Amino acid sequence: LTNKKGMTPLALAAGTGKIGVLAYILQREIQEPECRHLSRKFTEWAYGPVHSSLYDLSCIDTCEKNSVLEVIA
Amino acid sequence: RSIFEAVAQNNCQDLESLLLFLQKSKKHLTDNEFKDPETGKTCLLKAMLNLHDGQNTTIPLLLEIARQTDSLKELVNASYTDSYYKGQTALHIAIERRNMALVTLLVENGADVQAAAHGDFFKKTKGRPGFYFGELPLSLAACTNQLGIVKFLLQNSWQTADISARDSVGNTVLHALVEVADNTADNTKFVTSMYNEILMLGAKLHPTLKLEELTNKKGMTPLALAAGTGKIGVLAYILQREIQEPECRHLSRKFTEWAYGPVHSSLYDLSCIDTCEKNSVLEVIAYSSSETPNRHDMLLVEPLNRLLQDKWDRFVKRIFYFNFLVYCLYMIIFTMAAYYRPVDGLPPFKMEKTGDYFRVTGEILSVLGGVYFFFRGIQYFLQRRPSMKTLFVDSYSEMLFFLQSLFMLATVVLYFSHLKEYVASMVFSLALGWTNMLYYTRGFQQMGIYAVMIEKMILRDLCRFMFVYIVFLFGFSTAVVTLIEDGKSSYNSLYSTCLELFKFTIGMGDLEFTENYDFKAVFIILLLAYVILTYILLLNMLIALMGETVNKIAQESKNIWKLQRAITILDTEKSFLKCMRKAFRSGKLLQVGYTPDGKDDYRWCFRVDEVNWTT
Ligand SMILES: CCCC[N@@+]1(CCCCCN2CCCC[C@H]2C(=O)Nc2c(C)cccc2C)CCCC[C@H]1C(=O)Nc1c(C)cccc1C
């Protein structure tokens, strides 16, 4: 959801300079399977002691508008 | 086909009808109709992966279903087929999922405990995802910290795994255990713990087997492998490994002699340590390429530092001093020969006075020393056979002595070709010669650390400062030359003006050196900008950065100096003539105790006397 600045909560946290909120949001991992789709950091396979992880790049990469990278830069 | 789908939900209903269907068709679970065409995925494997709470109920039922088809011994030992996982076995999946009960269950049904999990995924390879563990269920249990499972796999009833079984690369369990460590806290903790555990287990099971001396395909014992790859924690544990159990006491590596009151005499075992052996830990660490991390730190562990210091204080200090003195005389003679060169005609020059005879003798000795250093550099480039990066990034002194020899040989070539230019070459060889005496600062602690810091500055700070300074100097020199009209010392050349603006840096610059322009204001503005940027800003900033660098490399310098002295000691011991090199083996031959079979355990041990005040 966007405010009247068209400025999403992640985008707002990036632009305003709130770093703790940004660190939480970008590595948000949720254990509950009923809402696990919310999270943004997905383990992909955990053979032994190694883990592959996927970080969602939606609204972070420059391909969108008001991306986090562009707003920080 | 959808049996995997049924098992994923842990539904046992469909398998009851599947058993009857199989009895109707008289088929087996291992038939190709039930294996994935590209992976060879079997029903037992799919059941093992899609576990719930660590226990899936369909696994035993599938076991009986296979058994009535007479396929228990074949279904369980089924493996992947795709090259990525080629060799993976359901026992491996049991191990990595950490299911004791399922491991016992599989080993009951005739599971092989020697299945080489040797796919592409299970090989140590940089850049791609993977996990190297030794290609065996024993090794996989070891490298994943299941002490119970390894104890079981070594001491079960159905089938016990082989402790000394090697994989494709030839690693035992100990080699893989070493190769999995990565020098952190908990990793080192558990690696050392289970290394000890497997040593006791091997001592119990095979008391006559020296497990720790098995070598992989490169012929490296686990100790030497730990030294080579840079696993400092494993090395520290192994070299000081002390075991108090009387049955495993012979496995200890750091004993005691007597403990009168508060003072003890601890013996350290020098086997595979002292350079008299092959691939000894000292040689392995000293000659290791710079890629291996912790290379400087690994000399800090007992008894390595004490051993090297003993060698130095006992028979290498004198040899190093003699080498220093000989090089000093060589440079003195070289300098006196070059200084007194005739300054008339073309070379070679005639031998007229007695002074000419002396000078010819000096020239002969100088060329002889240059040839000697040339050949020594060639021999170093052969024996080490270092890579180009290691050649230009690590030696830095074999390179410099070699370069001096190259200049000497170019000098003699030019000298006998009737060229004056020989002088040029010679003076370079002369300058380098003297500035190579910093090498011998290795032999003294304070000066050695000082020279190490000099190196560190030249490489860290001076290079960056020089790049920026060159950019500024060239830019402003071009600007000034452009501004300056006809020079008629005619600073209308780029060289002379670069020199004039360089004079500023050495505190000797002139702000009014030309008077031969059209815009005095522009000239003054340019010179003031240059002075402010380089003299005031850049040079003082360089001083500040050297201060910070000094602050940050206080201990690295000492470590690097100690490693340099280590290399010097090793080379000196190797090169020294045989009439005494054997006469100064380090340590003493002492009867530590008794072998597990029972016999005198004579070892070459190094004695250190220490004191403790908790008694
Ligand atoms: C460049 C530093 C080398 C450090 N180095 C060699 C020391 C030799 C003394 C030479 N001087 C030192 C001080 C001034 C520069 C230089 C010099 O002549 N400049 C120069 C030139 C190039 C032309 C004309 C005129 C001059 C003055 C220190 C001792 C060991 C060898 C090596 C070392 O550090 N090697 C090592 C490593 C890296 C990592 C790990 C282990 C090791 C052994």
Swiss-Prot record, chain B:
Motif (Selectivity filter) on chain: 507-510
Keywords, sorted A to Z: ANK repeat, ATP-binding, Calcium, Calcium channel, Calcium transport, Calmodulin-binding, Cell membrane, Cell projection, Glycoprotein, Ion channel, Ion transport, Membrane, Metal-binding, Nucleotide-binding, Phosphoprotein, Postsynaptic cell membrane, Repeat, Sodium, Synapse, Transmembrane, Transmembrane helix, Transport
Chain positions with Phosphothreonine modification: T30, T256, T568
A cellular component term, taken from the record's GO annotations: plasma membrane
Binding, Na(+) 1: G507
Annotated signal peptide: none
Region described as AD: spans on this chain: 548-576
Topology feature Cytoplasmic, residues: 1-318, 383-395, 442-444
Listed result of changing Y396A: Loss of sensitivity to capsaicin. Impairs response to inhibitor SB-366791
Binding site for resiniferatoxin: Y396, S397, T435, R442
Ranges within the bilayer without spanning: 494-515
Residues the record lists as binding Ca(2+): D510
Compartmental location: Postsynaptic cell membrane; Cell projection, Dendritic spine membrane; Cell membrane
Task performed by this protein: Non-selective calcium permeant cation channel involved in detection of noxious chemical and thermal stimuli. Seems to mediate proton influx and may be involved in intracellular acidosis in nociceptive neurons. Involved in mediation of inflammatory pain and hyperalgesia. Sensitized by a phosphatidylinositol second messenger system activated by receptor tyrosine kinases, which involves PKC isozymes and PCL. Activated by vanilloids, like capsaicin, and temperatures higher than 42 degrees Celsius.
Assembly, per entry: Homotetramer. Interacts with PIRT. Interacts with TRPV3 and may also form a heteromeric channel with TRPV3. Interacts with CALM, PRKCM and CSK. Interacts with PRKCG and NTRK1, probably by forming a trimeric complex. Interacts with the Scolopendra mutilans RhTx toxin. Interacts with TMEM100. Interacts with PACS2.
Name of the molecule in the record: Transient receptor potential cation channel subfamily V member 1
Natural source organism: Homo sapiens (Human)
Gene this protein is translated from: TRPV1
Full-protein residues shown: 116 to 752 of 839
